[PDB]
Design an enzyme around this catalytic site. Structure first.
Site, mmCIF file in Angstrom:
data_model
loop_
_atom_site.group_PDB
_atom_site.id
_atom_site.type_symbol
_atom_site.label_atom_id
_atom_site.label_comp_id
_atom_site.label_asym_id
_atom_site.label_seq_id
_atom_site.Cartn_x
_atom_site.Cartn_y
_atom_site.Cartn_z
ATOM 1 N N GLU A 248 34.165 24.732 46.969
ATOM 2 C CA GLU A 248 34.409 23.906 45.790
ATOM 3 C C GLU A 248 34.996 22.559 46.237
ATOM 4 O O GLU A 248 34.611 21.502 45.732
ATOM 5 C CB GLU A 248 35.377 24.611 44.822
ATOM 6 C CG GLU A 248 34.876 25.968 44.291
ATOM 7 C CD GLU A 248 35.827 26.592 43.274
ATOM 8 O OE1 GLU A 248 36.635 27.466 43.656
ATOM 9 O OE2 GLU A 248 35.776 26.200 42.091
ATOM 10 N N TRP B 35 42.487 30.840 42.309
ATOM 11 C CA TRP B 35 42.595 30.129 43.577
ATOM 12 C C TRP B 35 41.206 29.638 43.968
ATOM 13 O O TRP B 35 40.202 30.166 43.495
ATOM 14 C CB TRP B 35 43.227 31.001 44.679
ATOM 15 C CG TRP B 35 42.591 32.334 44.940
ATOM 16 C CD1 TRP B 35 41.461 32.583 45.669
ATOM 17 C CD2 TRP B 35 43.066 33.607 44.491
ATOM 18 N NE1 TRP B 35 41.206 33.933 45.704
ATOM 19 C CE2 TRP B 35 42.177 34.586 44.988
ATOM 20 C CE3 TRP B 35 44.161 34.017 43.715
ATOM 21 C CZ2 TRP B 35 42.346 35.952 44.734
ATOM 22 C CZ3 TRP B 35 44.331 35.377 43.460
ATOM 23 C CH2 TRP B 35 43.425 36.326 43.971
ATOM 24 N N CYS C 206 31.194 33.111 37.355
ATOM 25 C CA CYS C 206 32.342 33.309 38.232
ATOM 26 C C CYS C 206 32.099 34.336 39.337
ATOM 27 O O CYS C 206 31.803 35.502 39.070
ATOM 28 C CB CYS C 206 33.576 33.698 37.404
ATOM 29 S SG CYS C 206 35.086 33.907 38.381
ATOM 30 N N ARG D 256 35.105 37.522 40.177
ATOM 31 C CA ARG D 256 35.387 38.580 39.215
ATOM 32 C C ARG D 256 35.872 39.937 39.728
ATOM 33 O O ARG D 256 36.201 40.810 38.933
ATOM 34 C CB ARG D 256 34.175 38.768 38.297
ATOM 35 C CG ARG D 256 34.079 37.700 37.214
ATOM 36 C CD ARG D 256 32.862 37.921 36.314
ATOM 37 N NE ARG D 256 31.617 37.502 36.949
ATOM 38 C CZ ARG D 256 30.409 37.833 36.501
ATOM 39 N NH1 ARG D 256 30.293 38.597 35.417
ATOM 40 N NH2 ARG D 256 29.319 37.389 37.118
HETATM 41 C C1 HEM Z 1 40.956 34.486 41.667
HETATM 42 C C2 HEM Z 1 40.138 33.505 42.133
HETATM 43 C C3 HEM Z 1 38.960 32.972 41.574
HETATM 44 C C4 HEM Z 1 37.951 32.421 42.318
HETATM 45 C C5 HEM Z 1 37.842 32.467 43.853
HETATM 46 C C6 HEM Z 1 36.967 31.909 41.383
HETATM 47 C C7 HEM Z 1 35.830 31.173 41.756
HETATM 48 C C8 HEM Z 1 34.924 30.564 40.876
HETATM 49 C C9 HEM Z 1 33.844 29.687 41.274
HETATM 50 C C10 HEM Z 1 33.443 29.317 42.697
HETATM 51 C C11 HEM Z 1 33.293 29.187 40.144
HETATM 52 C C12 HEM Z 1 32.228 28.074 40.011
HETATM 53 C C13 HEM Z 1 32.937 26.730 40.189
HETATM 54 C C14 HEM Z 1 32.021 25.533 39.997
HETATM 55 O O1 HEM Z 1 30.889 25.554 40.529
HETATM 56 O O2 HEM Z 1 32.447 24.565 39.322
HETATM 57 C C15 HEM Z 1 34.022 29.794 39.046
HETATM 58 C C16 HEM Z 1 33.715 29.577 37.713
HETATM 59 C C17 HEM Z 1 34.381 30.203 36.642
HETATM 60 N N1 HEM Z 1 35.436 31.100 36.761
HETATM 61 FE FE1 HEM Z 1 36.213 31.874 38.420
HETATM 62 N N2 HEM Z 1 37.316 32.184 40.068
HETATM 63 C C18 HEM Z 1 38.575 32.791 40.173
HETATM 64 C C19 HEM Z 1 39.408 33.050 39.059
HETATM 65 C C20 HEM Z 1 39.071 32.839 37.718
HETATM 66 C C21 HEM Z 1 39.934 33.186 36.585
HETATM 67 C C22 HEM Z 1 41.380 33.644 36.665
HETATM 68 C C23 HEM Z 1 39.202 33.017 35.447
HETATM 69 C C24 HEM Z 1 39.577 33.204 34.094
HETATM 70 C C25 HEM Z 1 40.553 34.000 33.555
HETATM 71 C C26 HEM Z 1 37.910 32.519 35.901
HETATM 72 C C27 HEM Z 1 36.914 32.079 35.049
HETATM 73 C C28 HEM Z 1 35.781 31.387 35.435
HETATM 74 C C29 HEM Z 1 34.916 30.711 34.491
HETATM 75 C C30 HEM Z 1 34.971 30.789 32.946
HETATM 76 C C31 HEM Z 1 34.047 29.977 35.250
HETATM 77 C C32 HEM Z 1 32.981 28.999 34.761
HETATM 78 C C33 HEM Z 1 33.550 27.585 34.631
HETATM 79 C C34 HEM Z 1 32.492 26.573 34.238
HETATM 80 O O3 HEM Z 1 31.572 26.944 33.478
HETATM 81 O O4 HEM Z 1 32.579 25.407 34.679
HETATM 82 N N3 HEM Z 1 37.811 32.420 37.299
HETATM 83 N N4 HEM Z 1 35.014 30.664 39.487
HETATM 84 N N1 LIG Z 2 38.202 28.732 41.491
HETATM 85 C C1 LIG Z 2 38.083 28.284 40.246
HETATM 86 N N2 LIG Z 2 37.291 27.249 40.019
HETATM 87 C C2 LIG Z 2 37.009 26.641 38.708
HETATM 88 C C3 LIG Z 2 36.262 25.295 38.840
HETATM 89 C C4 LIG Z 2 37.003 24.352 39.812
HETATM 90 C C5 LIG Z 2 36.141 23.133 40.256
HETATM 91 N N3 LIG Z 2 34.895 23.628 40.864
HETATM 92 C C6 LIG Z 2 36.905 22.239 41.251
HETATM 93 O O1 LIG Z 2 37.986 21.740 40.882
HETATM 94 O O2 LIG Z 2 36.408 22.059 42.366
HETATM 95 N N4 LIG Z 2 38.718 28.894 39.225
HETATM 96 N N5 LIG Z 2 39.895 29.750 39.313
HETATM 97 O O3 LIG Z 2 40.215 30.276 40.361
HETATM 98 O O4 LIG Z 2 40.584 29.913 38.340
#
Ligand code: HEM
Ligand SMILES: N=C(NCCC[C@H](N)C(=O)O)N[N+](=O)[O-]
Ligand code: HEM
Ligand SMILES: N=C(NCCC[C@H](N)C(=O)O)N[N+](=O)[O-]
Ligand SMILES: [Zn+2]
EC number: 1.14.13.39
Lengths: 414, 416
Positions: free
Chosen positions: A295, A290, A118, A121
């Site tokens: 993505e 968000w 992520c 973070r």
């Molecule tokens: C606030 C905005 C956030 C943004 C901009 C963000 C962005 C991202 C991005 C770009 C990825 C990779 C997506 C992909 O390639 O499929 C990701 C993965 C992830 N995020 Fe974040 N994230 C956010 C919030 C969160 C929240 C609230 C949580 C959990 C409480 C979180 C947990 C994770 C996890 C566990 C992954 C890995 C998912 C997987 O293995 O497919 N994220 N996030």
């Molecule tokens: N931004 C986040 N992304 C989680 C994975 C979404 C996926 N790539 C897609 O639908 O394109 N997570 N989040 O903000 O909780």
């Protein structure tokens, strides 16, 4: 022992000492690195028909409890000592235990903080945690999920949130959300194998139909939810249209773009991952924040196995699709990502571009280096799908490892 | 399932198993506890100078493995010639402490080293390498002659040909043959008073070393550096490459008429010269190699990296983009045009080059060929996926396994 970590853009060096706290093994070995693999071959979350080894569980629980009291600066206090005894007492007599809401909130935030893939973070400390452990039916799951969506969406001013349903229990089925995300577009297999809609959702679209859903026939039909209570068949629920915010895609200067009829939903909400805290496992805990623009604009719309709209946009742009050397694919992708950012900004819906996101992540790395002596990160997922080396994270070496609390992948319930 | 790593391609949904990694005889930097796959120089292969002769027992095992590899490649494993060669190597090491390779063994070993390089995306060409044997070289002056011949043959007036020149291996308690420069062709990097750098910031140290050794520096942004060549137990000697041998390409854009006015350019021949070629325990400290450029190496990394020429902002300003906000994607737009300019200019000047789309498609073919031929292919994902438009290429969607196979090219400490 402790790895030296270098940033090649700045020449700065740090040493990751946090990795020594890892207790779970990754897929790599001195013989070969498997860092690029998406899913584990064994690090899964095997069945839960029997009670987890008391010894193992108890060591994980004590460690988590210790983490919790350190966070509130009350380590070694009276409460700390007594809480440990409580946990010891519950496991010895029942083979499991339960978290207090305060520990759950801390654990959920820590799991996000520890998520190596992520890039968002820096926001880890701001997470609304909905305790849904008081749920006993699919119908109740649907209500909690609808409330999660309303709160998270907030009319375009997205707010990060997670809803935690009941933990897994020995010999009993799990609470599970079958959908991969709360909001997804249908994918209908037609004619010669081709697909109308999102190809990534073919299997789930079919399962929904099999369970009584009257399918649509468009490219962006929002799917219904399949929610499952322990040892019961999943139930079908249609999301109230007014609850699902969507954004019509148009381009700042390309008049014809809107004519493509493209769109995407505002809320990314992964709902098929497992949340592990102190040895306890939560099989249904959808979370959302968000979108980062790539993505949608890059992966969802341009991946060959997804909407694959690159060639259409190129033709409308009247580019030379005859050869790779014209970089028509690169030019089209940039405008598509531009349209996504332009549209979300116009519709007043929260979104972050890849440059702004990676810059915030570098700050997060610095914060964590001072706070914990390191930060687990998976380079291939942190660096954006387009313009990789144009962002700062590309030039930063990263150490990847597993810390708990953690979010993990789990088997599909069907 | 099979007791080997399972590898998936998410675009096609196909699966393969890597059995070749079982042949790895050297450990990388990762452990079950943590992955260090992203480190550029993890202290692993790093061929740190090991003066005193190597353990006859260690060299022997490495030598035996290589000889077995060679005889397998020509389908004569277990033959009389194979057992006789093994005896010859063991006897030579027994009396001298080291041994020597036959001509054909060197050719095989050098091609295998390239074939084994995890960070190279152009490996579909591995079988067509021209191997120049320079193991008779006995002076710094002669190294220069060998190097100049390499550049002329490899450049071939724009129709580039892959090649490698191998100098004498390291010997028992004797000085090594070394090429101090990182590549045969590199632009100078001049430290300025205000602290900035004119030219290529990556070559500041080598530029200063050249000055310390008698080179009279220029003051341009694209000054070709001289070579510092070192023969055994001698200080390095300075040599200037004749300009007519160093082919360069002025950069212009297909539609943006003003791009040519930027005065940008790049050399046609990429030729890494500071890596160590290791074959059967023997170490060739000086063995420069070259092929041709993939356009993003120049257009994205060399020209746009923050610590390199860093030209993104200048070009964006020329395109009249909003460089005040990230969401305008000014960096993305400028980068695209800069890469197109590189491709357009090399094509115009009739100098071989391959765009990242064509290169990645060819690497996928290489993976398919290697799956059948060796049961896998060691690859470093972070280095194989291009620096721009990553997921727009097929390799992004392909999982990869990384490990060390020998023969191999390894990093080695700077001679100074
Ligand atoms: C606030 C905005 C956030 C943004 C901009 C963000 C962005 C991202 C991005 C770009 C990825 C990779 C997506 C992909 O390639 O499929 C990701 C993965 C992830 N995020 Fe974040 N994230 C956010 C919030 C969160 C929240 C609230 C949580 C959990 C409480 C979180 C947990 C994770 C996890 C566990 C992954 C890995 C998912 C997987 O293995 O497919 N994220 N996030
Ligand atoms: N931004 C986040 N992304 C989680 C994975 C979404 C996926 N790539 C897609 O639908 O394109 N997570 N989040 O903000 O909780
Ligand atoms: C024929 C055309 C070739 C192309 C298009 C090609 C392309 C590439 C690219 C894009 C990289 C990574 C560059 C970087 O990020 O710094 C690379 C690395 C490498 N290539 Fe190739 N290559 C070719 C020929 C060769 C040849 C002829 C050899 C050797 C016989 C070779 C050996 C290597 C090695 C060892 C590396 C890693 C260097 C390092 O770690 O810095 N390549 N190649
Ligand atoms: N293409 C090759 N690249 C090797 C490294 C060159 C470096 N990225 C640069 O100068 O940009 N090698 N080759 O073709 O022999
Ligand atoms: Zn690894």
């Amino acid at each position: 022992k402790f790895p030296r970590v270098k940033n090649w853009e700045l020449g700065s060096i740090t040493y990751d000492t946090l990795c020594a706290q890892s207790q779970q093994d990754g897929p790599c070995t001195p013989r070969r690195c498997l860092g690029s693999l998406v899913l584990p071959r064994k690090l899964q979350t095997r069945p839960s028909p029997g009670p987890p080894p008391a010894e193992q569980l108890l060591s994980q629980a004590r460690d988590f409890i210790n983490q919790y009291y350190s966070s509130i600066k009350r380590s070694g206090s009276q409460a700390h000592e007594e809480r440990l005894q409580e946990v010891e007492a519950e496991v010895a007599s029942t083979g499991t235990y339960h978290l207090r809401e305060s520990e759950l909130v801390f654990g959920a935030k820590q799991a996000w903080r520890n998520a190596p893939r992520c890039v968002g973070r820096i926001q880890w400390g701001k997470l609304q945690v909905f305790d849904a452990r008081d749920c006993s039916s699919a119908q109740e799951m649907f209500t909690y999920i609808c409330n999660h969506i309303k709160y998270a969406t907030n009319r375009g001013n997205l707010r990060s949130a997670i809803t935690v349903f009941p933990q897994r229990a020995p010999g009993r089925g799990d609470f599970r959300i079958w959908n991969s995300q709360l909001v997804r577009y249908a994918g209908y297999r037609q004619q010669d194998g081709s697909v109308r809609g999102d190809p990534a959702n073919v299997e789930i679209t079919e399962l929904c139909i099999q369970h009584g859903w009257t399918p649509g026939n468009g490219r962006f039909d929002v799917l219904p939810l399949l929610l499952q209570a322990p040892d019961e068949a999943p139930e079908l629920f249609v999301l109230p249209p007014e609850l699902v915010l969507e954004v019509p895609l148009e381009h700042p200067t390309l008049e014809w773009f809107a004519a493509l009829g493209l769109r995407w939903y505002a809320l990314p909400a992964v709902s098929n991952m497992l949340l592990e805290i102190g040895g306890l496992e939560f099989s249904a805990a959808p979370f959302s924040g968000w979108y980062m623009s790539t993505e949608i604009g890059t992966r969802n719309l341009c991946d060959p196995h997804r909407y694959n709209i690159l060639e259409d946009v190129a033709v409308c742009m009247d580019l030379d699709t005859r050869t790779t050397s014209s970089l028509w694919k690169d030019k089209a992708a940039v405008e598509i990502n531009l349209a996504v950012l332009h549209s979300f900004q116009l519709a007043k819906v929260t979104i972050v571009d890849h440059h702004a996101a990676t810059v915030s992540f570098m700050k997060h790395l610095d914060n964590e280096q001072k706070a914990r002596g390191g930060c687990p990160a998976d380079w291939a997922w942190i660096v954006p799908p387009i313009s990789g080396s144009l962002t700062p994270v590309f030039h930063q070496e990263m150490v990847n490892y597993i810390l708990s609390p953690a979010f993990r992948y789990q088997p599909d319930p069907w």
